[PDB]
Design a protein around this ligand. Structure first.
Ligand code: ATP
Ligand code: ATP
Ligand code: ADP
Ligand code: ADP
Lengths: 97, 228, 218, 393, 249, 384
């Protein structure tokens, strides 16, 4: 997946390790990345391996209610995740279809 | 829902509400005033101009039904066009068949007959004021989009109709001359128009027992504007 | 065993519950409709068994519930959705009134304003016996009811009540009371003694509550 | 003097900021008031909270008993048991459905028993009247008088009704055009009242669980009947119940139970008596006929759109404050907006004032009101909220 | 009993015509280029499968008459009905007038009848778009594009494909004005179908090309043979061998 | 606090010198009397030893209770954490002013009497709903529109910066404002710009998360949302994509569109609550405005409606100059060709184009963009 790993290294870690590289061009750092293809086709493991290589806290949420008690007492919205997510500022957001 | 206004649905109580909506829609138009006197019948409308680009001559409401009967216009003008055309042709074929001139009541009854007929699917957004002279003298008939035609000696229709009708109740009586009636009508029109009265701001017409349908007294009405 | 009365709500039946309360010298228990709806699970079952046990305790006694169509809603088959607490409440209600250990000591009185909501299980044949409809007050009952309610007024000897009930049709007991109370209202508005006969009719146009519309061209 | 202005005041106001702080040495509360007033009774009247009065926690009465008292007491869920409490009050204040202050070993009576209710309904009373009157509500004068003789003479002198032997009407519905109407005159009613004015908004009664709304309706009726007379306001009853239309799978039953139980509560079996209630909605055609029954809906105040005179009067009402060149043409303004609602008219005067304050003017003109009305009624004419709601469909 | 589907939008547009537009948006792909010596039209036929008989002789191409030809995209059934109507009206013109219709009069007749179809009746519009290529004595070779909305115009080279605007953009960036050069126009179509279609290697069993040219007062209309199509294709991919030679420089 | 308001003279005058001398002498007698109260009446010391005696009377732990009712005379019923409520007494120093139902109270451990009120340890969702810092550049960043900017300054910014004009107007500033138009024209950013400009507290949540998994939780959610809005400051509240609540259906909700309607009626109440609202301002933004219930849009609930048109080409070149300002561009590029490169393009489109050109230059480690970068950018960004 060599072209794919090339472009994902272009998209996520360059605006982590070298923000001045983007400041040298004056372009906004990307925030949202879409991965698509047939299921069981080099996704989730790629995301996890990138997060491990980049020393970023890999987080994923399925919307289950087991994990709900780990975020808030009711946590009726989803944005609440940020007040703990920003406590691990090298972090990456992922979830399934 | 939309099935409520399908074609013909009266009310939870009372008559058809869509013709009542035509009744409230008739107030979204320029006013008109009509006075029936023994000396003659006077009609007056507001041009309601919006800019000095278009010519006021094309801004036409009052038309000639025939040589002794005229009428105003109100509400939707294109709705009025069909009724005026039919009234003209029925008067003409009535003269053709009956070698005479008719009463205003016949024309008023005819347009009342067409008014209910549903061009279909809605009543016409127009209220007319037939005026003229016949064998029994001066005549002035009021017509509504519900079709209930009725005779009136003095009337105001359109927007601001009820305040003008109140002033008519204040000032109109039986033994008023034609000049007096015209002056009173212009006075009331002056106090109900939002803009200053100009030469082409309004329009006037009259019907006399002697003369035919008058040619709108154009460029003579500045005499009866400047004096007052 | 088991009486149910039904009909349109303006028809009047409640008053018969108060009257039969007034007439018997026995223990009388009353229930609201959804009074047996609790989210402590089976608490309504406890309420049912407790109420009927207390009813059993007083051997001369009758049990009345108003407005059973809250609980008597027909059961149904569905997935991922559907209320089921009221199924337990209705089932224990039906069973304890009829089923095992039949008993003839209390009589169930059952009010509702509609019938097709009701589950067939409760209205089956003997779980309730007498189904009675309230007819619309046809022509003389209206005059009788307004006479009853205007009994507390100093009625002038010019009234024609059957004339009123003829000109005021399709009106039930509640609006029939509304006639006399708003007649008293308009009488106090003008300021006088008790009304005359015609003074009721300007009340009735208030009662029917017609939409205001300047429709005179008739 | 001008740049030297800042040399006299500072020498004293900084000193002021020193001594005011030096006096301000009773602060940093985090759960206190000024202790010279918070602990103003920091003397022994603190110790008498300890030795004279002891805990006396809450309780719940269950059942009475013959002869000697021996009543049965619930705590909340702790234990369910039978004692005689004490003897300092006569045994006639004990009725089921009440709460005594009861100890754990001595079980002292302490105080008589008040009822327990949700704090939400206690919060739900507003105890504040908005500064709106019966004068600043114009365009609905006959609607005004129709509600005047509902919430006045029963609250005022009852000797007229007693003398004529007529029970006053109870169930009154007030309704009008959508958006302009019942709400602000309801604030006026709450302004002119004297007894309690219990608010009810219909959307809040729905709960996560089933049947709780019945419980809070019962509680609010109980706390209402604690008063001699009290006013009840209902808003948007369309959501709190339409009709019983159930088919197949259960649909909207959870609110149906609430609406039907309040219907049971309003009529039959010793009703509230001297409690005046009133409801206002947005669409009347969808309400249930059983709720529409008189005895719960006796009067039918219906507000419409004002023809001309109400429009002129509201033009008077909202526009006694803005600067104008004396003369006005408010009646022709009303003629310019035939099918226009009251809040729309106030918006027109608001935007006229905004056009006046655009560059530098202080008094709006007649053409400024024209510039208001054309960009209100016939530039925002696309939505206007009127046409599908004048049919109330 | 609830079907209006004839009224304007609350903002002014029509829901039906825009639904028709995005229905054409996911349809097949066909493109055409005008030239001074003639006109070409290239399409990819969809549902390319091994079990097709392929006995219709370029079914996506419909010879409206001996002079002017058609191509369609959208619903095949509505396309059949519409093309039959085009045959009917064109040959009614030939019956009334003993000469071929030039190009545009039949286009205007179609636009009129489809406007009447989207004016009243309360029926669904025909979600078909058509390309018209022909010859006349008045303007030589003439090309028109009829959208289902009723609007039409005289684009020199255009398409109604699933990537319509893409090929329009490459045509706009890479068109030479007034140069017939029919071989270069074929190469232009080949590279456009190369870059636009998601599939690669440009299988001649996936595409069809038709040509129209004036010859001896007859305006001969031909369909390129499979061998000719693959020869032109292979010449196209061998043409891009020198493009990837600058690399470093 | 709250000494005296006077800023009228602000000059070398006896109208300042007199005031300052009188107030400093008032502080002088205040100081002299408080010196009297702990010199010939020190008791022990009477300042913190009384506090020490209270703190001794205060129990060491907190049997925290929840308040449910009030009785005036120094006692009430409080509910314990385990649920067994008590009718304990209160303290004289229990500062009986900030007592409210449902609030935490410090009680004793032995007699559990109401010792004091407990300050709330913040709140979870007030942190989530409140935007902390200013996002980005102010009104110099938009460009092109220049008309709705003045309008929204007049309706929102002008009441705060100039709270004088309406006073001589004797008029009320407009309350409810809708932003609408085709998507991508700059509504939720115009939102960002006005968030940057303002000094008042700012609230933001999108309508999409107003759906919830039970009955009544949506209306309740709106209730304490506006409660937080009122209880902090003069505040501006921003809701984006309201139309989602009417357009996109879901299955996670217990109730269907019915509970949606209940939430709608609650928020219609909330915009025109007959209770005293105050200085809370309301800003909306929604592309699909026609699907909304029009009674939400009414005057008194919504006063302004602002259309956001597709940008003009003279505005397009302004956007080109604005966004490409900080980046290094070669002379081979031209903005004018890219102006009409798409007939229907938005302000998001040009930013996406320039960012993709930036990353494409980053592919070959190049610092300056070239024309072919945009020529390959256009089909990647727009054309799919
Ligand atoms: N008679 C009146 N005179 C002056 N203003 C009026 C009058 N009637 C209504 N209004 C205006 O109506 C506006 C609010 O209407 P109100 O909320 O009371 O109506 P409603 O029918 O209860 O609708 P909603 O509560 O849903 O907005 C206010 O701005 C008030 O000025
Ligand atoms: N006039 C404009 N100039 C530059 N960028 C613009 C313009 N209008 C919108 N944008 C872009 O739109 C994006 C979103 O901005 P904003 O939050 O204001 O919402 P929006 O443009 O209405 O679109 P969306 O609804 O898709 O979020 C931003 O990336 C911004 O660059
Ligand atoms: N390129 C790959 N090499 C090895 N294993 C793979 C590869 N792609 C997918 N898999 C297998 O597929 C499984 C899950 O697929 P993955 O792509 O990780 O997520 P998703 O199932 O969401 O596509 C993994 O357990 C992995 O073993
Ligand atoms: N003689 C009567 N016949 C019928 N109805 C009456 C009579 N007198 C009074 N009523 C009305 O009938 C009502 C009785 O309540 P009812 O409508 O039976 O209750 P529900 O609708 O809950 O079943 C009273 O409110 C009263 O207004």
């Amino acid at each position: 997946l060599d072209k794919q790993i090339k472009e994902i290294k272009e998209v996520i870690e360059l605006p982590v390790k070298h923000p001045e590289l983007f400041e040298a061009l004056g372009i906004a750092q990307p925030k949202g990345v879409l991965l698509y293809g047939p299921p069981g086709t080099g996704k989730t493991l790629l995301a996890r391996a990138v997060a491990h290589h980049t020393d970023c806290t890999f987080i994923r949420v399925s919307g289950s209610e087991l994990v709900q008690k780990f975020i808030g007492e009711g946590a009726r919205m989803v944005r609440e995740l940020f007040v703990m997510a920003r406590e691990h500022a090298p972090s990456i957001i992922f979830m399934d279809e | 829902s939309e099935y409520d206004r399908g074609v013909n649905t009266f009310s939870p109580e009372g008559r058809l509400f869509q013709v009542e909506y035509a009744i409230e829609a008739i107030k979204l138009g320029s006013t008109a005033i009509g006075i029936q006197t023994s000396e003659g019948v006077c009609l007056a409308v507001e041009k309601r101009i919006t800019s000095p680009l278009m010519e006021p001559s094309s801004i036409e409401k009052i038309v000639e039904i025939d040589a002794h009967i005229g009428c105003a216009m109100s509400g939707l003008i294109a709705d009025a066009k069909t009724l005026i055309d039919k009234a003209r042709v029925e008067t003409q074929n009535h003269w053709f068949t009956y070698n005479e001139t008719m009463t205003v009541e016949s024309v008023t009854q005819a347009v009342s007959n067409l008014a209910l007929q549903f061009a279909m699917s809605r009543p016409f957004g127009v209220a007319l004021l037939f005026g003229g002279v016949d064998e029994k003298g001066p005549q002035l008939f009021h017509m509504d989009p519900s079709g209930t035609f009725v005779q009136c000696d003095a009337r105001a229709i359109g927007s601001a109709s009820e305040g003008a009708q109140s002033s008519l109740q204040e000032v109109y009586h039986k033994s008023m001359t034609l000049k007096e009636a015209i002056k009173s009508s212009l006075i009331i029109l002056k106090q109900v128009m939002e803009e200053k009265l100009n030469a082409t701001n309004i329009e006037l017409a009259t019907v006399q027992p002697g003369q035919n349908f008058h040619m709108f007294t154009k460029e003579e009405l500045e005499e009866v504007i400047k004096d007052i | 065993k088991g009486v149910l009365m039904y009909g349109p709500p303006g028809t009047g039946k409640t008053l018969l519950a108060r009257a039969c309360a007034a007439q018997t010298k026995a223990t009388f228990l009353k229930l609201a409709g959804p009074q047996l709806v609790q989210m402590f699970i089976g608490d309504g079952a406890k309420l049912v068994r407790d109420a009927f046990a207390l009813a059993k305790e007083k051997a001369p006694s009758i049990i009345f519930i108003d407005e059973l169509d809250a609980i008597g809603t027909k059961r149904f088959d569905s997935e991922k959705a559907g209320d089921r607490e009221v199924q337990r409440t209705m089932l224990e209600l039906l069973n304890q009134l009829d089923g095992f250990q039949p008993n003839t000591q209390v009589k169930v009185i059952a009010a509702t304003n509609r019938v097709d909501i009701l589950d067939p299980a409760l209205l089956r044949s003997g779980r309730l016996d007498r189904k009675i409809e309230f007819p619309m007050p046809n022509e003389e009952a209206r005059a009788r009811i307004m006479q009853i309610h205007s009994r507390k007024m100093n009625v002038s000897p010019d009234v024609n009540y059957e004339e009123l009930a003829r000109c005021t049709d399709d009106f039930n007991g509640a609006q029939c009371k509304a006639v006399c109370v708003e007649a008293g209202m308009i009488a106090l508005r003008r300021g006088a003694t008790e009304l005359t006969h015609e003074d009721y009719m300007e009340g009735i146009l208030e009662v029917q509550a017609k939409k205001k519309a300047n429709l005179q061209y008739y | 003097y001008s740049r030297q202005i800042k040399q006299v005041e500072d020498d004293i106001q900084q000193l002021l900021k020193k001594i005011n702080e030096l006096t301000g040495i009773k602060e940093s509360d985090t759960g206190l008031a000024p202790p010279a007033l918070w602990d103003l009774a920091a003397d022994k009247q603190t110790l008498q909270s300890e030795q004279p009065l002891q805990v006396a926690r809450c309780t719940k009465i269950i059942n009475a008993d013959s002869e000697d008292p021996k009543y049965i007491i619930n705590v909340k869920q702790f234990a369910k048991f039978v004692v005689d409490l004490s003897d300092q009050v006569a045994p006639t204040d004990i009725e089921e459905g009440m709460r005594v202050g009861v100890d754990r070993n001595k079980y002292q009576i302490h105080i008589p028993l008040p009822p327990k209710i949700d704090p939400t309904v206690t919060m739900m009373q507003v105890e504040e009247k908005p500064d709106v009157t019966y004068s600043d509500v114009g365009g609905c004068k006959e609607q005004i008088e129709k509600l005047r003789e509902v919430v006045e003479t029963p609250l005022l002198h009852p000797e007229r009704f007693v003398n004529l032997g007529i029970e006053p009407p109870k169930g009154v519905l007030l309704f009008g055009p959508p958006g302009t109407g019942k709400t602000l005159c309801a604030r006026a009613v709450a302004n002119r009242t004297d007894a309690c004015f219990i608010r009810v908004i219909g959307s809040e009664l729905v709960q996560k669980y089933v049947g709780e709304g019945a419980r809070m309706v019962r509680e609010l009726f109980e706390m209402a009947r604690t008063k001699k007379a009290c006013l009840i306001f209902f808003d948007e009853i369309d959501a709190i119940g339409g009709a019983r239309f159930d088919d197949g799978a259960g649909g909207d039953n959870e609110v149906q139970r609430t609406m039907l139980e309040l219907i049971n509560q309003l009529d039959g079996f010793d009703p509230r008596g001297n409690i005046k209630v009133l409801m206002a909605t947005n669409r009347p055609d969808t309400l249930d006929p059983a709720l529409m029954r008189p005895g719960r809906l006796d009067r039918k105040i219906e507000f419409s759109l004002p023809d001309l005179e109400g429009r002129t009067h509201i033009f008077k009402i909202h526009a006694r404050s803005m600067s104008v060149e004396r003369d006005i043409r408010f009646e022709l303004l009303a003629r310019l907006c035939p099918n226009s609602t009251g809040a729309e008219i106030r918006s027109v005067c608001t935007e006229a004032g905004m056009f006046a304050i655009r560059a530098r003017r202080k008094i709006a003109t007649e053409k400024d009101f024209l510039e208001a009305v054309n960009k209100v009624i016939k530039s925002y004419a696309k939505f206007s909220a009127t046409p599908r709601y004048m049919t109330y469909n | 009993y609830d079907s209006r589907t004839t009224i304007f939008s609350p903002e002014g547009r029509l829901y039906q015509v825009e639904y028709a537009m995005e229905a054409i948006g996911h349809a097949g792909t066909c493109l055409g280029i005008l030239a001074n010596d003639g006109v070409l039209l290239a399409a990819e036929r969809r549902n390319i499968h091994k079990l097709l008989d392929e006995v219709f002789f370029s079914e996506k191409i419909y010879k409206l008459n001996e002079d002017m030809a058609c191509s369609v995209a959208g619903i095949t059934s509505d396309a059949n009905v519409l093309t039959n109507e085009l045959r009917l009206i064109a040959q009614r013109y030939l019956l009334q007038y003993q000469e071929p219709i030039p190009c545009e009069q039949l286009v205007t007749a179609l636009c009129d009848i489809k406007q009447a179809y989207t004016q009243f009746g309360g029926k669904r519009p025909f979600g078909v778009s058509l390309l018209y290529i022909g010859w006349d004595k008045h303007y030589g070779f003439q090309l028109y594009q009829s959208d289902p909305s009723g609007n039409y115009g005289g684009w020199k080279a255009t398409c109604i494909g699933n990537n319509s605007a893409a090929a329009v953009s490459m045509l706009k960036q890479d068109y030479k004005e007034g140069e017939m050069t029919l071989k270069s126009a074929l190469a232009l179509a080949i590279k456009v179908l190369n870059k636009t279609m998601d599939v690669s290697k440009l299988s001649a069993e996936k595409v069809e090309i038709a040509t129209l040219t004036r010859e001896n007062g007859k305006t001969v209309i031909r369909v390129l043979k499979q061998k000719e199509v693959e020869q032109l294709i292979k010449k196209h991919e061998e043409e891009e061998a020198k493009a990837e030679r600058e690399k470093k420089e | 606090a709250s000494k005296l308001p006077l800023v009228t003279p602000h000059t070398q005058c006896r109208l300042k010198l007199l005031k300052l001398e009188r107030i400093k002498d008032y502080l002088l007698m205040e100081e002299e009397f408080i010196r009297n109260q702990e010199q010939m009446k020190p008791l022990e010391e009477k300042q913190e030893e009384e506090r020490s005696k209270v703190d001794d009377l205060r129990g060491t732990p907190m049997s925290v209770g929840t308040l449910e009712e009030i009785i005036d005379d120094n006692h009430a019923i409080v509910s314990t954490s385990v649920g067994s409520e008590h009718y304990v007494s209160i303290l004289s120093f229990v500062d009986k002013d900030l007592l409210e139902p449902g609030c935490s109270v410090l009680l004793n451990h032995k007699v559990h009497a109401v010792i004091g009120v407990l300050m709330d340890d913040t709140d979870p969702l007030v942190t989530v709903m409140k935007v902390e810092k200013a996002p980005q550049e102010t009104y110099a960043d938009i460009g092109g529109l220049d008309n709705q900017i003045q309008e929204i300054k007049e309706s929102v910014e002008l009441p705060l910066t100039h709270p004088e004009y309406y006073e001589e107007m004797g008029i009320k500033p407009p309350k409810g404002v809708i932003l609408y138009g085709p998507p991508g024209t700059g509504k939720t950013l115009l939102a960002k710009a006005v968030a940057n400009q303002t000094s008042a507290t700012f609230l933001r949540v999108v309508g999409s998360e107003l759906i919830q998994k039970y009955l009544g939780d949506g209306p309740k959610l709106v209730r304490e949302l506006f409660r937080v809005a009122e209880e902090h400051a003069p505040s501006i509240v921003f809701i984006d994509e309201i139309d989602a609540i009417g357009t996109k259906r879901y299955d996670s909700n217990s109730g269907g569109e019915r509970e949606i309607q209940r939430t709608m009626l609650e928020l219609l109440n909330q915009l025109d609550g007959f209770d005293s609202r105050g200085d809370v301002k309301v800003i909306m933004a929604t592309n699909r405005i026609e699907t909304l219930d029009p009674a939400l849009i009414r005057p008194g609930r919504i006063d302004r409606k602002i259309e956001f048109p597709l940008p003009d080409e003279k505005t397009k070149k302004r956007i080109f100059q604005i966004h490409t300002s900080r980046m290094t561009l070669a002379d081979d590029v031209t903005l004018d060709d890219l102006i009409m490169a798409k007939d229907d393009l938005s302000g998001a489109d040009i930013k996406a184009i320039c960012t993709e050109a930036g990353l494409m230059a980053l592919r070959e480690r190049r610092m300056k963009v070239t024309n072919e970068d945009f020529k390959k950018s256009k089909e990647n960004v727009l054309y799919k």
